Structure formats: structure tokens, C-alpha cells
Amino acid sequence: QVQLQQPGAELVKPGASVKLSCKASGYTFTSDWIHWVKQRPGHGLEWIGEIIPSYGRANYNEKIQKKATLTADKSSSTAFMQLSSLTSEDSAVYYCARERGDGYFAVWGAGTTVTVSSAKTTPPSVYPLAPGSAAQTNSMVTLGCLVKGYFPEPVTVTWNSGSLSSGVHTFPAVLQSDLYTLSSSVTVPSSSWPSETVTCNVAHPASSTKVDKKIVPRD
Amino acid sequence: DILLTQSPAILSVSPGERVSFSCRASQSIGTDIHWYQQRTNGSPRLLIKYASESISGIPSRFSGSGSGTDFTLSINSVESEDIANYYCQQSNRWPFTFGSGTKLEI
Amino acid sequence: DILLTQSPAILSVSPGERVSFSCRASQSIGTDIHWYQQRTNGSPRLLIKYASESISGIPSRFSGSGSGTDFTLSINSVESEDIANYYCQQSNRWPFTFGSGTKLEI
Amino acid sequence: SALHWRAAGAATVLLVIVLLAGSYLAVLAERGAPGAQLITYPRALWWSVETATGVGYGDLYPVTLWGRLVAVVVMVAGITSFGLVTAALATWFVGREQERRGH
Amino acid sequence: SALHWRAAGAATVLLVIVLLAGSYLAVLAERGAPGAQLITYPRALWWSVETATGVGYGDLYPVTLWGRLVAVVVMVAGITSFGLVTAALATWFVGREQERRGH
Ligand SMILES: CCCCCCCCCO
Ligand SMILES: CCCCCCCCCO
Ligand SMILES: [K+]
Ligand SMILES: [K+]
Ligand SMILES: [K+]
Ligand SMILES: [K+]
Ligand SMILES: [K+]
Ligand SMILES: [K+]
Known part of the structure; x- marks a missing residue:
């Protein structure tokens, strides 16, 4: 423990x-x-x-x-x-x-x-990042989450409650107009999505908020 | 107070190659030096205590040596997970002090 | 006899900025160093005793640190009245000796 | 058990308590003083023993007022304890020699 | 109070006087000699105690003739005092053992 x-x-x-x-x-x-x-x-x-x-x-x-x-x-x-x-x-x-x-x-x-x-505390807005209709795929597919407009640092981004660690990296946040913004990348086999669900978990301890965002193919 | 010099600040090495971090103390401190690893966005992690004593849970490729003023942390065959910052720390005289740190690159 | 080196001889700083005077002893003297302030046409005035011990009547922005051979006098937010010469002095071995002094400019 | 062997045993037990408490208090007193080496418990205990035995190699020593006061208590406890043992041995020998002489 | 407990008390008081006078005289003797460290009263007192107890860490010691002569007096006062206490304890134990044996 x-x-x-x-x-x-x-x-x-x-x-x-x-x-x-x-x-x-x-x-x-x-x-x-x-x-x-x-x-x-x-x-x-x-x-x-x-x-x-x-x-x-x-x-x-x-x-x-x-x-x-x-x-x-x-x-x-x-x-x-x-x-x-x-x-x-x-x-x-x-x-x-x-x-x-x-x-x-x-x-x-x-x-x-x-x-x-x-500056004032601001919870983050989490937007999904799915490939466009014209995007071709190899053996792997790349998904993401857009954590935008939060303050202050930090945020903790996990995928599928931590079970999906490999092929995952989160970029450092950028600061502009007293608000931070970052993205997190995840790469899973093409055959596994979207049959097997992929969801990012964004926690922002400064505002005591933790939100989920399921990544689905664009309609 | 005891100054701990870590040079070079950055160490570039090829995969599978042995690497050595140096820690130099401003005065003789016996073997009262300890090594920590801090990966990106992580908390420090004890690797070696008292210059050469191994820690449970730490891979056997990590070892330490030296006494007096010159100390060395070594990694047999560097792999990707070893990419981090490495700090030394002395406990010989008050107050405890840290080295400036050395970054490992592959 | 114990030589006390004060470098630089002159320190220029902006108002409200933190400043640090250095005192280096030719051999290890524990914490037996003392700091004095001498304004223009004035007599020396004890600021810090035994490296870090504060003195009654001395503003809290004055502090000291160090042990062995390296000692530091610090001023948090330098103001105009701090313009003076600063001397260190050792009492570890006979005879007592003074440093060459450092002048503070704003 | 007679008085002298009782006091010797008590002094030995008390000495052990002084060594332990002395090691704890020394670290407590010495930490906060730049340059102090008597600042971790294992070597502080070793310091306590060599202080109580009067050996004093000089590898470790207090530099603060309270660390030095603690040291004085350890010294005196050591001198008293071993002094109490010698006195007990002398009493033992005097008594045995008394019987040997048929007095 | 018997003789042995009287002499012990006197030796303890006398030892305290030697420690104080010794600290004062050591500083007086050591100042004026380049490199001397036994030159301020607080640490001189600490030096006196560890000299009287025979611990002698080696953090402080006289380098002059008179400083060393002072040290010798402190040593002897220490050895005598603690030696006088041990002798007093032995007498106490011998007497009690004498009563215990109904003699
Ligand atoms: C006998 C002395 C007990 C230890 C005292 C602690 C000292 C505090 C340091 O400022
Ligand atoms: C027992 C000795 C008394 C102290 C003598 C003072 C020495 C003067 C130094 O030249
Ligand atoms: K002894
Ligand atoms: K000794
Ligand atoms: K030494
Ligand atoms: K010794
Ligand atoms: K010694
Ligand atoms: K020594």
C-alpha cells in the first residue's frame, strides 16, 4: 500500500x-x-x-x-x-x-x-480524437484525447483505468491566456478497435474533477 | 555544507552498453552516499544505499561503488526503462544535500 | 594562520533583490565564522554569529549559512540602508582573522 | 544475591538504557547543526558505546550544547557502571579471602 | 555520613572546581599560540570534561606547555575523583556484606 x-x-x-x-x-x-x-x-x-x-x-x-x-x-x-x-x-x-x-x-x-x-481554477474540457473517414489504417490505429483549457497543472491522463499502458504517451501542456492544453496518444491494434472499447480518464485534482471520454469512430 | 558534483549533466549511451554516473563530494564522506532515479513526471526512487548496497525490487544491473569523495553509479547494459534523471545524496553531515543530477540518454 | 577570502570585492544588486556574500576559509573551521557590517564612517556592527545565529536588533532579512570552509551571508530584498562593507571573521584558531571585505552597491 | 551483585546488575541494565536513550537524544540534538556527524541512529549507538567505555576513537562526537550534555551523562553512566562492577568484584574477593583465612 | 562518602562528595566538588579553573587557564595559556583551538571558554569547558573523563575524542587539545600542564591536572583530578568514588562504593559494599554475614 x-x-x-x-x-x-x-x-x-x-x-x-x-x-x-x-x-x-x-x-x-x-x-x-x-x-x-x-x-x-x-x-x-x-x-x-x-x-x-x-x-x-x-x-x-x-x-x-x-x-x-x-x-x-x-x-x-x-x-x-x-x-x-x-x-x-x-x-x-x-x-x-x-x-x-x-x-x-x-x-x-x-x-x-x-x-x-x-488566475482562477478551471476544470478541463475533454474531446475525443478519432481518425477521419479518409484515413487509411495499418496493423495499428492511433487514438487520442484533447484536454483543453484547464488551470492549474497538473492533469493525470490514463487509458481504460490504467489497464492500457503500452503504446501510450501524454504530451506536456502548453500555456496560453492563463489556460493549459495537452493531448494524450494511444495506439492499439486496428482489429481491436472499436470492437474493444477505448476510453481515456482525465483527472484534474485542482478542481476535484475526473471525467471519462469513450473514443468512438466518427459517424 | 557538503557539495555534491554530478558531471556530466547528460550522458548519451548506446543500448546494451555499460554506463557510469559520477558523484563527487566536496569533502570525505566515507560511504554515506545514496542514489535515486526519477523518470519523467515521476517521484524519486531509491536505487542504491550506502554507496554499494542493493535495494529489494531494483534490477541487478544497477550497482554502485566508491568511498571518500568519489562515487559511481553503474548500469550494466542500459535499456529503455533506464531513461531518467539520476541524483546522489549524502547523509554524512547535516544538512543532507543532493547532487545536481545526471540525465541518461539512449 | 587562517586566511579568509571574500570574493567578489564588489557586489551590485537591484533594489528588493536577494544578495549573497561569500566567505571562504583556507581550512575547515566548522561554523566559527562571524559577520560584521560597516557603513561609511561608521564602526563595525555584528550581524551574524557562528555562521547562522541571528543577533537581537538585526533585521530578519539578514541570514547566514555554511560550514567547514564555505560560508554565505544573505540579504532578502536589499534596501538602501544595507549599503556598506561586509566582513567575515573566524574564531576557530588563534589568531582571529578578518576577510578582505565585500562592498554592496545598489 | 547480595547487595553488590544486585547493584552491578542494575547498573548494567541502566547503562543499556542510557546507551539507547543517549543515541536517540544525541541525534535529536545534533541534527540542525551544520557539520554535525552524530545524526543517524546506528552510528549514534556505536558512538554511545565508545563514549561509555571511554575509548573515544574520535570518529564521532557531538558539537552542540545538548549533544555534549547527553555525552556527559553517557560518560558518567559508563564510569559509574564499570566502577560499580569493580567494587562488586572487590567485595566478592574480600569475602572469599575472609573465609579462606577462617575469620 | 562516613569518611568514604565524605571524600567522594569533596572530590566531586573539587572536580567541578578543576573543570572550571581548568577551562579558564587553558584559554589563557593557548591564546597566543598559532593554530591553537582551545581558545574560547564554552568549548574549553567541554574539553575539560572529556579530559577529566578520559574520553578524549581529539576534537580539542592543548598545544602549549602550560595548556598541557593544565590538562595533566585535569586528567589527574578526574582519575582521582572517579577512583575515589569506586573506592567508596567498595567500602559500602564490603560493610553491607559484613552485616549480611552477621559479622
Ligand atoms: C538531556 C538533553 C535532552 C535532549 C535535548 C534536545 C535538544 C534540542 C535541540 O535544540
Ligand atoms: C597551571 C598553569 C596556569 C596557567 C598559566 C598561564 C600561562 C601563560 C601563557 O604564557
Ligand atoms: K579510560
Ligand atoms: K580514552
Ligand atoms: K583526526
Ligand atoms: K581517546
Ligand atoms: K582520539
Ligand atoms: K582523531
């Missing part, structure tokens, strides 16, 4: 504050430390701070400006990071990690994508 559970995304206005959570499961010891790591898009891993839940003491990276405050709740086994007075420089993915007091990060969280912006 997933040892460390983090929210998918958080939208914060310039100057506002946010408290990220990190619910831990599995074996828990008094020697456990919870760490937090900041990663900006295209950049590497940056250590923020640590906390020992069994005592409540926290330490922070002295090399950077302290915008974080670590707390923990023993009753719910959840770690918290209070980020205050955020600017666009604070926009990044924040991972939490568990260390058994022996120096290495055995397990990491999925990460919480924090976006600092004045």
Missing part, C-alpha cells in the same frame, strides 16, 4: 499561505523522520526541512529563505508543511519523504504541485 499520500495540487494567490499534508501508513517507528523536498520544473531536488513526529522537533535548510513551517499529528500519522507568503518563485512540486533515521529516503510521496497565481 502507498506509504505516503499527498494531495495532487494546490492553488495559492500571491501573498497567501497554504498547508500541505502528508499522510503516512505502513510501519512507523519513533526513529522516523519526515522530510520535504522542493523541485521546480526542469530543476533538481532541493531539501527544505525535516521533522521527527515522535518528538516534534523540526530543522530547516539554512541556505534558503525559510518559507516553511513543519508540524505533525501523531494521532492521524500526518505531516504538515505550512508555506506562507508565496510568490511565483515558490511554484513547484513538493515531495514528502520518509527516512528511518539511517540517512536515506526509503519512500517518497507522489508530490503536491503548488501553483502560485492570481
Whole structure:
């Protein structure tokens, strides 16, 4: 089971504050430390701070400006990071990690994508992508989903609830007029479609929405 | 604080060929180095702990070596799933620090 | 004796921007470094002691970090009153020594 | 069991508790201080033992106030425990020599 | 209170005085010698304790003649004090074992 559970995304206005959570499961010891790591898009891993839940003491990276405050709740086994007075420089993915007091990060969280912006949350519109009537097909056929006009990042696109992984790749989103847009490609054998259904699953954690879109041949 | 240098930043290799990532520490840290793999849009994943100790679930083609200031992560016969970013991390002195990372290309 | 290198000698920065002064020691001195500010025609003024420990009366935008041989004094959002000379000083080994100093310009 | 053998056993058990608690508290005290090496539990325990035995190789040592205070407690616990064992051995030998002399 | 418990208490108090005076004199002796590290009072005190306990991590040590003479006094004070405590514990155990045997 997933040892460390983090929210998918958080939208914060310039100057506002946010408290990220990190619910831990599995074996828990008094020697456990919870760490937090900041990663900006295209950049590497940056250590923020640590906390020992069994005592409540926290330490922070002295090399950077302290915008974080670590707390923990023993009753719910959840770690918290209070980020205050955020600017666009604070926009990044924040991972939490568990260390058994022996120096290495055995397990990491999925990460919480924090976006600092004045823009408003917008759920995505998902449109199917089926070949036109004149398009000839080989042994394989290519389908897709158009995830357009959402904010902020990220979205998670799966095909057939995850069962269809091979031949699948999702393109990075493009930003324009405070709205993101991406597409996801899937390639299955020609003989298998549309006899065997193909459906993309688009989750947008920032708006708590998850929609499906079955891919059918054009009428 | 301990600086970890990872050079080169990008490593291009042919399929099935052995590759080696380097990690250099600004001071002697014994064997307190750990390696992580991060694929595109994924979370970091522990590969090697304490310079050379293998981890359960990690393919045997991954190995590590070195001590003091010079450390190496190696992959015997690189395959497509190995395409990712590779980070080293030290736990010898507070605070823990990460290397700048090395990207593997095929 | 312990040599403290401060480079660059002059640091130009825009208002409200974060600045960082560097101090490098000729040998490892743990965290026994201290920072002083000297404005024009003024006497030196302690800003940070023991590399990172804050001093009462000193604005919170002043902070320090580092250990061993590499030390850093930082100013979050530089304002006009920060225009001065900045010196580091070690107390790890006798005799105490000062760095050559870094001038901040806006 | 007499008093001296009782106190020796108690001191040994207490020493084990000090080593464990000492290792935990040392890590807690040393983390947060740049350059500190006494920051992971396994080697902290090894540090505790060589501190209690007075060997002190110098491969590991506290650099903070509270880490050093913890160290002092470990040292004293070590000196006292092994000092209590020596005293117990002396009592044992004195008693046996007393019987050997028919007194 | 008997003699042995009195001497132990006195040795402990005296040891505390030696640690304090030793820390003060060490700094006084070591300052003026290039490369000396035993030159500030807080760490000098920590040095005094680990010297008296015989641990000697080697993170700090005197390099001057008088600093080393001070160190010798701290060592001897430590060895004597803890040696006096062990002797006191042995006397306590011998006496109790004497009563236990109805002699
Ligand atoms: C005997 C001392 C107990 C450990 C104290 C923890 C120190 C907190 C570090 O700021
Ligand atoms: C027991 C020794 C007392 C300290 C002597 C001071 C030494 C002066 C350094 O030249
Ligand atoms: K000894
Ligand atoms: K020793
Ligand atoms: K050494
Ligand atoms: K020793
Ligand atoms: K030693
Ligand atoms: K040594």
C-alpha cells in the first residue's frame, strides 16, 4: 500500500499561505523522520526541512529563505508543511519523504504541485480524437484525447483505468491566456478497435474533477 | 555544507552498453552516499544505499561503488526503462544535500 | 594562520533583490565564522554569529549559512540602508582573522 | 544475591538504557547543526558505546550544547557502571579471602 | 555520613572546581599560540570534561606547555575523583556484606 499520500495540487494567490499534508501508513517507528523536498520544473531536488513526529522537533535548510513551517499529528500519522507568503518563485512540486533515521529516503510521496497565481481554477474540457473517414489504417490505429483549457497543472491522463499502458504517451501542456492544453496518444491494434472499447480518464485534482471520454469512430 | 558534483549533466549511451554516473563530494564522506532515479513526471526512487548496497525490487544491473569523495553509479547494459534523471545524496553531515543530477540518454 | 577570502570585492544588486556574500576559509573551521557590517564612517556592527545565529536588533532579512570552509551571508530584498562593507571573521584558531571585505552597491 | 551483585546488575541494565536513550537524544540534538556527524541512529549507538567505555576513537562526537550534555551523562553512566562492577568484584574477593583465612 | 562518602562528595566538588579553573587557564595559556583551538571558554569547558573523563575524542587539545600542564591536572583530578568514588562504593559494599554475614 502507498506509504505516503499527498494531495495532487494546490492553488495559492500571491501573498497567501497554504498547508500541505502528508499522510503516512505502513510501519512507523519513533526513529522516523519526515522530510520535504522542493523541485521546480526542469530543476533538481532541493531539501527544505525535516521533522521527527515522535518528538516534534523540526530543522530547516539554512541556505534558503525559510518559507516553511513543519508540524505533525501523531494521532492521524500526518505531516504538515505550512508555506506562507508565496510568490511565483515558490511554484513547484513538493515531495514528502520518509527516512528511518539511517540517512536515506526509503519512500517518497507522489508530490503536491503548488501553483502560485492570481488566475482562477478551471476544470478541463475533454474531446475525443478519432481518425477521419479518409484515413487509411495499418496493423495499428492511433487514438487520442484533447484536454483543453484547464488551470492549474497538473492533469493525470490514463487509458481504460490504467489497464492500457503500452503504446501510450501524454504530451506536456502548453500555456496560453492563463489556460493549459495537452493531448494524450494511444495506439492499439486496428482489429481491436472499436470492437474493444477505448476510453481515456482525465483527472484534474485542482478542481476535484475526473471525467471519462469513450473514443468512438466518427459517424 | 557538503557539495555534491554530478558531471556530466547528460550522458548519451548506446543500448546494451555499460554506463557510469559520477558523484563527487566536496569533502570525505566515507560511504554515506545514496542514489535515486526519477523518470519523467515521476517521484524519486531509491536505487542504491550506502554507496554499494542493493535495494529489494531494483534490477541487478544497477550497482554502485566508491568511498571518500568519489562515487559511481553503474548500469550494466542500459535499456529503455533506464531513461531518467539520476541524483546522489549524502547523509554524512547535516544538512543532507543532493547532487545536481545526471540525465541518461539512449 | 587562517586566511579568509571574500570574493567578489564588489557586489551590485537591484533594489528588493536577494544578495549573497561569500566567505571562504583556507581550512575547515566548522561554523566559527562571524559577520560584521560597516557603513561609511561608521564602526563595525555584528550581524551574524557562528555562521547562522541571528543577533537581537538585526533585521530578519539578514541570514547566514555554511560550514567547514564555505560560508554565505544573505540579504532578502536589499534596501538602501544595507549599503556598506561586509566582513567575515573566524574564531576557530588563534589568531582571529578578518576577510578582505565585500562592498554592496545598489 | 547480595547487595553488590544486585547493584552491578542494575547498573548494567541502566547503562543499556542510557546507551539507547543517549543515541536517540544525541541525534535529536545534533541534527540542525551544520557539520554535525552524530545524526543517524546506528552510528549514534556505536558512538554511545565508545563514549561509555571511554575509548573515544574520535570518529564521532557531538558539537552542540545538548549533544555534549547527553555525552556527559553517557560518560558518567559508563564510569559509574564499570566502577560499580569493580567494587562488586572487590567485595566478592574480600569475602572469599575472609573465609579462606577462617575469620 | 562516613569518611568514604565524605571524600567522594569533596572530590566531586573539587572536580567541578578543576573543570572550571581548568577551562579558564587553558584559554589563557593557548591564546597566543598559532593554530591553537582551545581558545574560547564554552568549548574549553567541554574539553575539560572529556579530559577529566578520559574520553578524549581529539576534537580539542592543548598545544602549549602550560595548556598541557593544565590538562595533566585535569586528567589527574578526574582519575582521582572517579577512583575515589569506586573506592567508596567498595567500602559500602564490603560493610553491607559484613552485616549480611552477621559479622
Ligand atoms: C538531556 C538533553 C535532552 C535532549 C535535548 C534536545 C535538544 C534540542 C535541540 O535544540
Ligand atoms: C597551571 C598553569 C596556569 C596557567 C598559566 C598561564 C600561562 C601563560 C601563557 O604564557
Ligand atoms: K579510560
Ligand atoms: K580514552
Ligand atoms: K583526526
Ligand atoms: K581517546
Ligand atoms: K582520539
Ligand atoms: K582523531
